[PDB]
Amino acid sequence: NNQKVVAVLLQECKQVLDQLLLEAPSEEDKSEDQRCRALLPSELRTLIQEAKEMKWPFVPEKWQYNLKDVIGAGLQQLLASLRASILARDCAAAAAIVFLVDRFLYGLDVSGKLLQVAKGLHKLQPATPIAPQVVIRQARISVNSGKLLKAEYILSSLISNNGATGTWLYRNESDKVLVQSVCIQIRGQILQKLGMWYEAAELIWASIVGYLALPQPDKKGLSTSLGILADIFVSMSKNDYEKFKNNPQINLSLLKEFDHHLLSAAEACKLAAAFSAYTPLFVLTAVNIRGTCLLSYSSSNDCPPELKNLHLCEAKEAFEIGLLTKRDDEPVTGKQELHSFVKAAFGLTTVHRRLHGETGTVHAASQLCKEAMGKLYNFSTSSRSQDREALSQEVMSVIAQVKEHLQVQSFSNVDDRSYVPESFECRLDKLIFQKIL
Amino acid sequence: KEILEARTLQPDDFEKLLAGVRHDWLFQRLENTGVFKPSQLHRAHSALLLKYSKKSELWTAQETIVYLGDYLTAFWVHHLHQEEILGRYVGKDYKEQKGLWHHFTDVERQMTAQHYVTEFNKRLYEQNIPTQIFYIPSTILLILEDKTIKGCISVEPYILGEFVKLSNTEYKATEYGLAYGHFSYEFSNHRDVVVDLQGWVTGNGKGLIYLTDPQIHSVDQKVFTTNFGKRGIFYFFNNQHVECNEICHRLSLTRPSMEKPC
Ligand SMILES: Nc1ccn([C@@H]2O[C@H](COP(=O)(O)OP(=O)(O)O[C@@H]3O[C@H]([C@@H](O)CO)[C@@H](O)[C@H](O)[C@@H]3O)[C@@H](O)[C@H]2O)c(=O)n1
Ligand SMILES: [Zn+2]
């Protein structure tokens, strides 16, 4: 399940497709396909049949209205079944498996090989439906590689055409609106990459409106759009924010309640964390950004002195929330998550330095943060699974020591599954599409 | 020594730097800091991340921790305020240790070029022309030991590519570069022009280009501008970019009216 072996297996699948492209259509092939599609768990088989039936433009997530775990568990078997269905010429099942593994493999940063095998499948049988999610993935990688015009072409095609793509068949209008909202969000990201902060914020607001128009709001999409909007608010100049604040078509509570782009960004981070309350990594990322926004605001000449400490305490809470996303002896595996934990630890230490001077506890926490940083670099440099597990353990031990030193106490949320205080979900309710298109 | 006295930042220094300081304040503040030794690699250090904005013309500091690693086969760096957690970043110190003025000047130059190229790419996108040339962002890390500056490092994202001169997509890299020079002239109210025809080409020669070693001619002289001023400007328009290209026209860039100075 390492990026490299999976990339090699996907290259092998695509080479098998190139081979079949030159040949004519064995019972051994369909026997192998049935065997590989029966070796897998029934949940994965149900997901495969639902994807082949096009019941959704995207694969659902628990808590959107685990998936990552069940996909990562049967990734080897799912790719084996993919290449088996490829030999059998059932391009529909292969496309369904592609749809099922697309998000996870984007996480592994090998979407290119997967899109290659997808285009090979389309070549073998052009009538095979391919999920809007995979086309949007192509647009995403085009954005990431800097082919902004190609990405915009794809996104505007999917938007103007009410989500229509290839031979895909929708089952309701809400799914079309959802696809349109995701595409508008990615267009906002395109403008953000160019630094067109105002227009980017406009498109992100349009995506938020689209998400809220669904019968069940897409909480994951909402968290995403609000995090992007926080980044945009951070990047904006005072004039961009003044202009985006006085726009009548933009009815956002965080705008008419805060008069500074950094405070608005911090509020938007709080909202994004709330919208992903059951996914601790997104909570940690959003609250790290919130603490950074507050550290910058409280240190600026625009912060009334009377309020400085208060905003620092807000930062405090922010970083504390991040540090509370994990417990002692709870394993961390990602490089991004380990980095974010060191970030939160140092942000809390810095808040304590800004509130209390050069105290002994602040100094001890700074030393612990430097030790964790060393371990984190050695983690990002190691290439063995046991070496990286021990390093993650040492980093998280240092993080727990910093939590102890700085006296981080848990919060109690009635929802025992939420990683954010109730003061975030509180704001969630009062956040505020066809005309926008 | 008095150098050690000047290298120590007081709470007031930290407060000013975290709020945002002007060029003149920053340069006068670090006047008697002298020259430092190479930073110690394979190590985590407390540091100040300093970033320069041409829009606001401000230097802003954030407290951070950086780990300095191995030299590139320039050395890998990783701090807590990177734009991209999973991305890779390289830091660089002059082989001959120099003062802080040089680091700050180089960063101001890079970020002025980047401001102009960002506006250039906005205009290009509005006109449906692919974006082809960019400038690597650059930041400063003041490596500190007990609130005392003990090092200064420049930090950039890592780019994998080959150095080229733009000599040899829809337009040649030379056309992008010269059109960008013209754009810098216009957008800057006829007071600046960025001239650079060299950089890192990526993606097997097919991909984007990140320009380096920029030369900024200007009548408003700054620490980072060239020694030529209007001369340079004239030269660019009379020898380098003699006749406009498609990009200049699609941007509605007019020809300057100048006389060979001196
Ligand atoms: N809270 C949150 C979630 C995700 N991200 C980041 O977004 C990008 C892309 O997410 P993805 O899950 O890989 O894209 P999918 O097309 O597979 O899923 C759809 O995602 C959108 C929206 O959340 C993101 O576009 C939803 O509206 C749709 O319903 C689908 O779920 C990831 O890198 C991820 O890290 C994020 O930042 N924050
Ligand atoms: Zn021209």
XYZ file of C-alpha atoms and ligand atoms in Angstrom:
738
model
C 0.000 0.000 0.000
C 3.057 2.194 -0.626
C 2.722 4.887 -3.274
C 5.482 3.253 -5.319
C 4.214 -0.339 -5.481
C 0.683 0.879 -6.205
C 2.041 3.159 -8.938
C 3.872 0.203 -10.480
C 0.705 -1.922 -10.331
C -1.298 0.839 -12.022
C 1.370 1.170 -14.725
C 1.087 -2.598 -15.212
C -2.695 -2.304 -15.575
C -2.289 0.462 -18.154
C 0.279 -1.602 -20.067
C -2.144 -4.539 -20.087
C -4.730 -2.140 -21.522
C -2.317 -0.990 -24.239
C -1.701 -4.668 -25.032
C -5.401 -5.556 -25.235
C -5.812 -2.510 -27.492
C -3.997 -4.415 -30.261
C -5.705 -7.803 -29.867
C -9.029 -9.438 -30.389
C -11.007 -10.944 -27.545
C -10.784 -16.731 -22.949
C -12.952 -18.467 -20.367
C -9.826 -18.385 -18.197
C -10.072 -14.582 -18.260
C -13.641 -14.468 -16.939
C -12.822 -17.207 -14.411
C -9.929 -15.092 -13.107
C -12.175 -12.020 -13.027
C -14.882 -13.811 -11.038
C -12.242 -15.197 -8.669
C -10.717 -11.778 -8.000
C -14.144 -10.146 -7.598
C -15.176 -12.883 -5.148
C -11.989 -12.881 -3.049
C -12.882 -9.381 -1.782
C -15.054 -8.389 1.248
C -18.844 -8.035 0.728
C -18.737 -4.337 1.594
C -16.319 -3.739 -1.282
C -18.496 -5.883 -3.568
C -21.570 -3.820 -2.665
C -19.625 -0.610 -3.279
C -18.470 -1.958 -6.651
C -22.013 -2.827 -7.700
C -23.299 0.574 -6.544
C -20.549 2.366 -8.470
C -21.291 0.310 -11.585
C -24.947 1.323 -11.157
C -23.958 5.027 -11.018
C -25.955 5.653 -7.849
C -23.646 8.531 -6.925
C -21.445 11.128 -8.751
C -18.985 10.806 -5.843
C -18.253 8.014 -3.372
C -20.040 8.829 -0.083
C -18.210 9.491 3.151
C -19.302 8.537 6.588
C -20.392 11.735 8.312
C -20.961 13.874 5.201
C -24.696 14.201 5.433
C -14.969 4.532 7.582
C -14.547 4.673 3.762
C -10.845 5.407 3.859
C -10.151 2.410 6.103
C -12.131 -0.159 4.114
C -10.585 1.086 0.861
C -7.049 1.033 2.244
C -7.686 -2.454 3.619
C -8.745 -3.981 0.307
C -6.599 -1.815 -1.960
C -4.397 -4.699 -3.118
C -7.415 -6.923 -3.760
C -9.299 -4.054 -5.408
C -6.435 -3.381 -7.838
C -6.063 -7.103 -8.539
C -9.778 -7.223 -9.349
C -9.313 -4.106 -11.486
C -6.659 -5.745 -13.661
C -8.705 -8.966 -13.741
C -11.871 -7.238 -14.969
C -9.550 -5.535 -17.502
C -8.506 -8.933 -18.988
C -12.188 -10.053 -19.024
C -13.126 -6.868 -21.000
C -15.734 -5.841 -18.374
C -14.634 -2.231 -18.562
C -17.678 -1.288 -16.468
C -16.370 -3.102 -13.386
C -12.867 -1.714 -13.965
C -14.287 1.815 -14.133
C -16.297 1.139 -10.968
C -13.121 0.071 -9.149
C -11.353 3.176 -10.466
C -14.201 5.294 -9.070
C -13.895 3.481 -5.738
C -10.126 3.904 -5.364
C -9.848 7.382 -6.911
C -10.039 9.443 -3.714
C -7.674 7.228 -1.717
C -5.120 7.157 -4.546
C -5.320 10.947 -4.797
C -4.293 10.832 -1.148
C -1.346 8.661 -2.205
C -0.560 11.172 -4.990
C -0.717 8.670 -7.849
C -3.871 9.969 -9.530
C -1.877 10.210 -12.769
C -1.443 6.465 -13.238
C -5.091 5.901 -12.286
C -6.296 8.468 -14.823
C -4.007 6.795 -17.370
C -5.709 3.447 -16.812
C -9.074 5.249 -16.934
C -8.303 6.748 -20.343
C -7.075 3.346 -21.517
C -10.399 1.871 -20.454
C -12.291 4.613 -22.287
C -10.144 3.738 -25.308
C -11.048 0.044 -25.049
C -14.795 0.755 -24.736
C -15.750 4.423 -25.185
C -19.299 3.741 -23.968
C -18.095 2.774 -20.478
C -19.400 5.366 -17.978
C -16.751 7.048 -15.832
C -17.768 8.904 -12.637
C -17.816 12.708 -12.601
C -15.403 12.367 -9.664
C -12.695 11.010 -11.979
C -13.184 13.795 -14.540
C -12.991 16.335 -11.722
C -9.809 14.560 -10.632
C -8.356 15.189 -14.092
C -9.310 18.842 -13.665
C -7.676 18.864 -10.213
C -4.369 17.525 -11.506
C -4.518 19.995 -14.409
C -4.870 22.783 -11.841
C -1.997 21.394 -9.765
C 0.296 21.104 -12.812
C -0.583 24.654 -13.902
C -2.730 23.844 -16.946
C -5.341 26.328 -15.809
C -7.031 26.643 -19.213
C -7.541 22.878 -19.588
C -8.911 22.625 -16.052
C -11.273 25.521 -16.663
C -12.448 23.962 -19.890
C -13.321 20.752 -18.035
C -14.958 22.529 -15.098
C -17.006 24.954 -17.214
C -18.110 22.048 -19.410
C -19.354 20.179 -16.338
C -20.986 23.308 -14.894
C -22.828 24.618 -17.952
C -24.057 21.103 -18.787
C -25.606 20.479 -15.343
C -22.932 17.942 -14.430
C -23.345 15.958 -17.646
C -20.268 13.909 -18.506
C -19.736 11.066 -20.952
C -22.286 8.283 -20.685
C -22.807 8.825 -16.948
C -26.429 8.756 -15.786
C -27.560 10.836 -12.822
C -30.369 9.786 -10.492
C -31.548 13.183 -9.200
C -30.985 16.911 -9.571
C -29.318 17.291 -6.166
C -26.344 15.293 -7.465
C -26.059 17.629 -10.449
C -26.090 20.639 -8.126
C -23.433 18.963 -5.965
C -21.168 18.387 -8.970
C -21.673 21.988 -10.066
C -20.769 23.188 -6.569
C -17.558 21.142 -6.487
C -16.594 22.488 -9.913
C -17.268 26.091 -8.853
C -15.115 25.442 -5.767
C -12.229 24.237 -7.911
C -12.653 27.303 -10.149
C -12.334 29.425 -7.032
C -9.102 27.552 -6.329
C -7.925 28.281 -9.883
C -8.411 32.006 -9.338
C -6.784 31.687 -5.895
C -3.654 30.191 -7.468
C -3.447 33.306 -9.656
C -3.890 35.600 -6.649
C -7.256 36.995 -7.792
C -8.471 36.995 -4.211
C -11.809 38.785 -4.640
C -13.100 36.710 -7.567
C -11.801 33.546 -5.906
C -13.757 34.389 -2.750
C -16.826 35.034 -4.914
C -16.608 31.574 -6.484
C -16.035 29.953 -3.078
C -19.148 31.718 -1.753
C -21.059 30.411 -4.774
C -19.849 26.904 -3.900
C -21.066 27.387 -0.320
C -24.494 28.484 -1.554
C -24.617 25.440 -3.829
C -23.681 23.081 -1.004
C -26.384 24.555 1.234
C -28.991 24.140 -1.524
C -28.824 20.345 -1.178
C -31.514 18.497 0.810
C -28.709 17.360 3.129
C -25.866 19.921 3.132
C -22.484 18.492 2.129
C -20.584 19.067 5.372
C -17.296 17.886 3.846
C -17.664 20.215 0.863
C -18.660 23.016 3.221
C -15.578 22.461 5.392
C -13.441 22.469 2.237
C -14.913 25.683 0.825
C -14.646 27.459 4.181
C -10.998 26.470 4.593
C -10.234 27.763 1.100
C -12.128 30.944 1.985
C -10.060 31.321 5.153
C -6.871 31.049 3.089
C -8.232 33.653 0.654
C -9.181 36.047 3.459
C -5.647 35.653 4.814
C -4.104 36.440 1.426
C -6.437 39.370 0.738
C -5.520 43.015 1.228
C -7.588 45.379 3.356
C -9.227 46.684 0.166
C -10.146 43.240 -1.176
C -11.828 42.465 2.154
C -13.596 45.837 2.364
C -14.954 45.217 -1.140
C -16.009 41.625 -0.404
C -17.663 42.758 2.838
C -19.909 45.356 1.191
C -21.076 43.086 -1.639
C -24.868 42.689 -1.252
C -25.117 39.323 -3.026
C -22.750 37.881 -0.388
C -24.769 37.213 2.779
C -22.210 35.770 5.201
C -22.409 36.185 8.972
C -18.630 36.114 9.424
C -18.382 39.158 7.137
C -20.902 41.478 8.815
C -19.596 40.391 12.243
C -15.835 40.921 11.770
C -14.053 43.968 10.357
C -10.643 42.411 9.620
C -9.664 39.803 7.044
C -7.637 37.883 9.642
C -10.539 37.709 12.113
C -12.839 36.632 9.281
C -10.307 33.988 8.236
C -10.127 32.727 11.833
C -13.924 32.509 12.035
C -14.022 30.641 8.712
C -11.413 28.225 10.096
C -13.635 27.628 13.136
C -16.540 26.872 10.802
C -14.441 24.517 8.661
C -13.290 22.596 11.727
C -16.914 22.347 12.894
C -18.043 21.042 9.491
C -15.423 18.297 9.774
C -15.939 17.636 13.491
C -15.594 13.863 13.098
C -12.337 13.911 11.079
C -9.482 14.882 13.414
C -6.844 15.691 10.772
C -8.978 18.365 9.098
C -9.803 19.747 12.545
C -6.092 20.012 13.324
C -5.282 21.734 10.020
C -8.130 24.247 10.347
C -7.382 25.106 13.979
C -3.653 25.494 13.233
C -4.574 28.027 10.562
C -6.959 29.699 13.035
C -4.260 29.988 15.669
C -1.873 31.425 13.090
C -4.482 33.993 12.035
C -5.000 35.014 15.655
C -1.279 35.150 16.466
C -0.832 37.478 13.466
C -3.839 39.667 14.318
C -2.954 40.083 17.998
C 0.615 41.023 16.993
C -0.543 43.640 14.467
C -1.163 47.367 14.815
C -4.812 46.800 13.854
C -5.603 44.915 17.079
C -6.912 47.180 19.881
C -4.582 46.637 22.856
C -7.546 46.023 25.175
C -8.384 42.998 23.001
C -4.890 41.609 22.365
C -4.775 39.069 25.202
C -8.339 38.026 24.360
C -7.420 37.123 20.775
C -4.349 35.343 22.114
C -6.626 33.239 24.318
C -8.619 32.433 21.187
C -5.378 31.250 19.590
C -4.745 29.288 22.778
C -8.040 27.454 22.432
C -7.350 26.862 18.739
C -4.017 25.157 19.291
C -5.348 23.276 22.306
C -8.111 21.846 20.134
C -5.513 20.678 17.656
C -3.381 19.096 20.342
C -6.464 17.356 21.735
C -7.208 15.614 18.429
C -5.037 12.715 19.657
C -4.463 10.937 22.963
C -1.398 9.475 24.645
C -0.334 6.162 23.088
C -2.518 6.820 20.017
C -0.540 6.163 16.824
C 0.019 8.764 14.117
C 1.095 7.670 10.649
C 0.908 10.661 8.308
C 3.710 13.120 7.668
C 1.220 15.976 7.307
C -0.440 15.086 10.616
C 2.832 14.781 12.534
C 3.942 18.128 11.107
C 0.603 19.658 12.107
C 0.975 18.351 15.658
C 4.428 19.896 16.004
C 2.921 23.073 14.537
C 0.112 23.137 17.106
C 2.545 22.444 19.958
C 4.798 25.314 18.924
C 1.818 27.601 18.361
C 0.545 26.938 21.872
C 4.065 27.468 23.247
C 4.217 30.766 21.341
C 0.839 31.847 22.706
C 2.164 31.146 26.201
C 5.256 33.216 25.406
C 3.087 36.079 24.135
C 0.899 35.899 27.261
C 3.599 35.022 29.878
C 7.233 36.099 29.316
C 10.347 33.995 29.294
C 9.133 31.571 31.934
C 10.681 28.204 32.708
C 7.692 26.236 31.443
C 7.702 28.183 28.168
C 11.408 27.408 27.775
C 10.892 23.705 28.497
C 8.058 23.584 25.958
C 10.247 25.331 23.364
C 13.001 22.767 23.953
C 10.483 19.932 23.607
C 9.228 21.521 20.373
C 12.769 21.618 18.965
C 13.293 17.962 19.915
C 10.010 17.038 18.225
C 11.129 18.987 15.150
C 14.340 16.984 14.946
C 12.421 13.731 15.267
C 9.915 14.896 12.642
C 12.669 15.636 10.148
C 14.217 12.221 10.795
C 10.737 10.764 10.190
C 10.344 12.574 6.865
C 13.850 11.308 5.989
C 13.518 7.653 7.007
C 12.359 5.051 4.485
C 11.563 2.006 6.756
C 8.064 1.256 8.271
C 9.318 0.287 11.765
C 11.775 3.198 11.898
C 8.983 5.560 10.945
C 6.587 4.047 13.489
C 9.127 4.455 16.300
C 9.777 8.033 15.154
C 6.060 8.850 15.089
C 5.820 7.386 18.596
C 8.696 9.555 19.834
C 7.238 12.681 18.225
C 3.823 12.062 19.805
C 5.459 11.346 23.169
C 7.112 14.770 22.957
C 3.744 16.271 21.988
C 2.143 14.673 25.064
C 4.946 16.104 27.195
C 4.226 19.575 25.790
C 0.516 19.057 26.520
C 1.405 18.180 30.126
C 3.797 21.116 30.541
C 1.300 23.658 29.172
C -1.648 22.130 31.081
C -4.018 21.294 28.239
C -7.362 20.122 29.624
C -9.938 18.350 27.488
C -13.347 19.766 26.658
C -16.544 17.765 27.078
C -18.809 17.654 24.017
C -22.202 15.940 24.295
C -21.317 14.354 20.962
C -18.625 11.939 22.036
C -17.497 11.754 18.398
C -16.803 15.475 17.903
C -13.239 16.789 18.004
C -14.347 20.434 18.376
C -15.995 22.275 21.304
C -19.705 23.010 21.169
C -18.834 26.703 20.736
C -18.006 25.876 17.080
C -21.117 23.857 16.224
C -22.970 26.726 17.907
C -21.894 29.136 15.168
C -22.438 26.527 12.449
C -26.233 26.868 12.254
C -26.486 30.536 11.225
C -24.051 30.441 8.223
C -26.403 32.722 6.200
C -27.752 28.801 -6.452
C -29.515 28.675 -9.824
C -29.373 32.470 -10.118
C -25.638 32.254 -9.312
C -24.980 29.980 -12.403
C 31.473 43.365 21.623
C 29.130 45.989 20.156
C 28.205 43.498 17.397
C 26.780 41.096 19.976
C 24.867 44.040 21.440
C 23.354 44.832 18.040
C 22.550 41.196 17.212
C 20.296 40.784 20.271
C 16.607 41.486 19.683
C 14.691 43.111 22.540
C 10.958 42.672 23.206
C 10.398 45.945 21.350
C 12.294 44.591 18.341
C 10.146 41.455 18.362
C 6.936 43.478 18.658
C 7.869 45.749 15.751
C 8.972 42.817 13.585
C 5.803 40.808 14.283
C 3.629 43.842 13.544
C 5.456 44.606 10.276
C 8.346 46.990 9.704
C 9.430 49.233 6.848
C 12.574 48.676 4.791
C 14.414 51.597 6.373
C 13.684 50.494 9.942
C 14.808 46.920 9.273
C 18.014 47.953 7.487
C 19.010 50.553 10.082
C 18.211 48.137 12.923
C 20.615 45.435 11.704
C 23.422 47.863 10.779
C 26.133 46.818 13.236
C 25.460 43.085 12.968
C 28.532 42.318 10.871
C 28.891 38.966 9.141
C 27.871 35.577 10.522
C 29.198 32.046 10.209
C 27.471 29.322 8.186
C 24.418 28.086 10.055
C 24.823 24.708 11.735
C 23.200 21.974 9.657
C 21.571 18.775 10.928
C 19.794 20.852 13.540
C 16.581 22.401 14.751
C 16.704 26.110 15.528
C 14.339 28.768 16.786
C 13.985 31.376 14.081
C 12.092 34.332 12.693
C 10.448 33.819 9.302
C 10.631 37.214 7.584
C 8.530 37.843 4.479
C 8.538 40.894 2.230
C 5.464 42.266 0.459
C 5.842 44.725 -2.417
C 2.156 45.671 -2.289
C 2.463 46.858 1.317
C 6.263 47.286 1.091
C 6.462 45.593 4.474
C 8.697 43.042 6.185
C 6.719 40.832 8.577
C 8.103 38.282 11.027
C 6.637 35.130 12.540
C 8.215 32.957 15.216
C 8.962 29.461 13.966
C 11.237 26.434 14.255
C 13.368 25.296 11.319
C 15.346 22.110 10.772
C 18.401 22.494 8.525
C 19.430 19.237 6.857
C 21.832 17.991 4.196
C 23.330 19.930 1.310
C 21.791 19.353 -2.112
C 23.886 17.303 -4.523
C 22.080 24.771 -0.933
C 20.594 22.482 1.701
C 17.231 21.009 2.594
C 15.228 22.986 5.148
C 11.905 22.352 6.859
C 10.183 24.869 9.128
C 6.738 25.070 10.693
C 5.398 27.916 8.511
C 5.817 26.407 5.051
C 3.026 26.939 2.514
C 3.210 23.208 1.694
C 3.729 20.719 4.518
C 4.522 17.795 2.211
C 6.520 20.007 -0.141
C 10.294 20.316 -0.132
C 12.203 23.531 0.560
C 15.847 24.499 0.087
C 17.774 27.116 2.003
C 20.939 28.871 0.885
C 23.695 30.987 2.496
C 26.382 32.866 0.541
C 29.554 30.713 0.237
C 31.367 33.876 1.361
C 29.524 34.941 4.509
C 27.872 38.327 3.980
C 25.713 40.721 5.946
C 21.961 40.711 6.399
C 21.589 43.615 3.940
C 22.436 41.277 1.039
C 19.852 38.652 2.027
C 17.093 41.227 2.462
C 18.023 42.993 -0.790
C 17.942 39.761 -2.793
C 14.559 38.849 -1.307
C 13.079 42.282 -2.016
C 14.288 41.945 -5.619
C 12.829 38.459 -6.072
C 9.483 39.498 -4.584
C 9.218 42.668 -6.687
C 9.806 40.563 -9.781
C 7.208 38.112 -8.478
C 4.648 40.870 -7.904
C 5.041 42.038 -11.493
C 4.872 38.483 -12.844
C 1.741 37.768 -10.792
C -0.032 40.766 -12.320
C 1.343 39.687 -15.707
C -0.160 36.230 -15.297
C -3.488 37.678 -14.166
C -3.603 39.690 -17.427
C -2.522 36.630 -19.447
C -5.242 34.456 -17.899
C -7.862 37.116 -18.612
C -6.718 36.983 -22.271
C -6.709 33.152 -22.429
C -2.917 32.898 -22.810
C -1.347 30.020 -20.826
C 0.813 31.069 -17.890
C 4.369 29.989 -18.656
C 6.856 31.937 -16.517
C 6.858 32.414 -12.738
C 9.164 33.533 -9.930
C 10.107 31.270 -7.036
C 8.951 32.909 -3.784
C 11.784 33.676 -1.377
C 11.741 34.235 2.375
C 14.262 34.972 5.132
C 14.981 32.922 8.248
C 16.824 34.683 11.060
C 18.333 31.772 13.019
C 18.313 32.812 16.686
C 20.149 31.596 19.799
C 18.831 33.050 23.072
C 17.053 35.943 21.262
C 20.342 36.684 19.506
C 20.589 36.490 15.729
C 23.268 33.926 14.924
C 22.382 33.269 11.289
C 20.506 34.448 8.232
C 19.276 32.031 5.549
C 17.261 32.389 2.351
C 14.442 29.877 1.815
C 12.736 28.810 -1.430
C 10.560 25.908 -2.574
C 12.484 23.131 -4.284
C 12.324 23.129 -8.090
C 13.560 20.203 -10.192
C 14.703 21.384 -13.618
C 17.583 22.616 -15.805
C 19.084 26.093 -16.115
C 18.398 27.717 -19.485
C 18.831 31.091 -21.182
C 15.447 31.144 -23.006
C 17.444 31.080 -26.281
C 17.184 27.293 -27.116
C 4.084 26.264 -26.028
C 2.126 28.818 -28.042
C 4.839 31.468 -27.579
C 8.588 31.197 -27.106
C 9.948 31.640 -23.595
C 11.802 34.688 -24.942
C 8.493 36.255 -26.001
C 7.066 35.686 -22.518
C 10.165 37.187 -20.892
C 10.284 40.313 -23.053
C 6.513 40.853 -22.911
C 6.820 40.593 -19.122
C 9.581 43.209 -19.156
C 7.340 45.532 -21.158
C 4.450 44.821 -18.773
C 6.630 45.622 -15.772
C 7.454 48.924 -17.453
C 3.794 49.836 -18.035
C 2.252 48.555 -14.785
C 5.008 50.283 -12.801
C 4.000 53.713 -14.177
C 7.061 53.698 -16.464
C 9.390 53.535 -13.451
C 10.606 49.912 -13.392
C 11.497 47.164 -15.842
C 12.500 43.597 -15.001
C 14.931 42.070 -17.470
C 15.854 38.434 -17.100
C 16.202 35.806 -19.745
C 17.430 32.839 -17.679
C 15.954 30.313 -15.254
C 14.908 26.811 -14.229
C 12.901 25.001 -16.913
C 10.913 22.056 -15.567
C 9.177 18.975 -16.896
C 11.606 17.559 -19.454
C 11.747 21.004 -21.048
C 7.978 21.042 -21.607
C 6.881 22.480 -18.282
C 6.803 25.849 -16.587
C 9.815 28.120 -16.159
C 10.918 29.800 -12.911
C 13.059 32.841 -13.682
C 16.161 33.681 -11.663
C 18.885 36.364 -11.374
C 16.381 39.191 -12.292
C 17.735 42.636 -13.136
C 15.456 45.553 -12.251
C 16.153 48.872 -13.983
C 14.371 51.831 -12.430
C 14.415 55.591 -12.019
C 13.356 55.229 -8.363
C 16.620 53.736 -7.141
C 16.545 51.138 -4.396
C 19.083 48.781 -2.843
C 18.015 46.045 -5.272
C 17.878 48.014 -8.536
C 20.696 48.058 -11.074
C 23.341 50.759 -11.525
C 21.864 51.852 -14.876
C 18.413 53.300 -14.203
C 16.833 54.936 -17.229
C 19.853 53.844 -19.282
C 18.887 50.221 -18.663
C 15.282 51.028 -19.494
C 16.261 52.585 -22.819
C 18.614 49.685 -23.539
C 15.837 47.134 -23.015
C 13.465 48.970 -25.330
C 16.095 49.836 -27.957
C 18.295 46.707 -28.047
C 16.639 43.795 -26.126
C 12.865 44.185 -26.988
C 13.138 46.163 -30.259
C 9.691 45.191 -31.576
C 6.704 43.906 -29.662
C 5.159 40.445 -29.971
C 1.636 39.037 -29.851
C 1.565 39.100 -26.044
C 2.374 42.814 -25.880
C -0.494 43.597 -28.262
C -3.035 41.358 -26.512
C -2.112 43.205 -23.314
C -2.443 46.615 -25.030
C 1.142 47.606 -24.210
C 2.217 50.772 -26.025
C 5.734 51.697 -27.146
C 7.653 54.097 -24.883
C 8.947 57.475 -26.046
C 12.515 57.765 -24.755
C 15.889 59.319 -25.532
C 19.209 57.531 -25.006
C 20.317 58.960 -21.631
C 23.772 60.329 -20.800
N -12.860 18.868 4.777
C -11.927 18.693 3.653
C -12.101 17.665 2.742
C -11.192 17.550 1.701
N -10.210 18.418 1.625
C -9.342 18.331 0.653
O -10.059 18.429 -0.710
C -9.290 17.811 -1.511
C -10.112 17.056 -2.521
O -10.957 16.218 -1.776
P -11.310 14.714 -2.395
O -12.046 13.936 -1.372
O -10.068 13.994 -2.785
O -12.249 14.936 -3.730
P -13.525 13.964 -4.160
O -14.017 14.411 -5.499
O -13.088 12.537 -4.220
O -14.736 14.114 -3.064
C -15.532 15.198 -3.176
O -14.896 16.297 -2.412
C -15.746 17.466 -2.361
C -15.066 18.510 -1.502
O -15.026 18.103 -0.157
C -13.641 18.663 -1.983
O -13.665 18.980 -3.338
C -17.128 17.101 -1.811
O -17.964 18.240 -1.872
C -17.755 16.033 -2.631
O -19.051 15.659 -2.057
C -16.919 14.844 -2.655
O -16.837 14.349 -1.304
C -8.409 16.718 -0.610
O -6.999 16.973 -0.836
C -8.696 16.908 0.606
O -7.440 16.882 1.430
C -10.083 19.384 2.513
O -9.191 20.149 2.420
N -10.924 19.522 3.512
Zn 6.290 44.920 -26.052
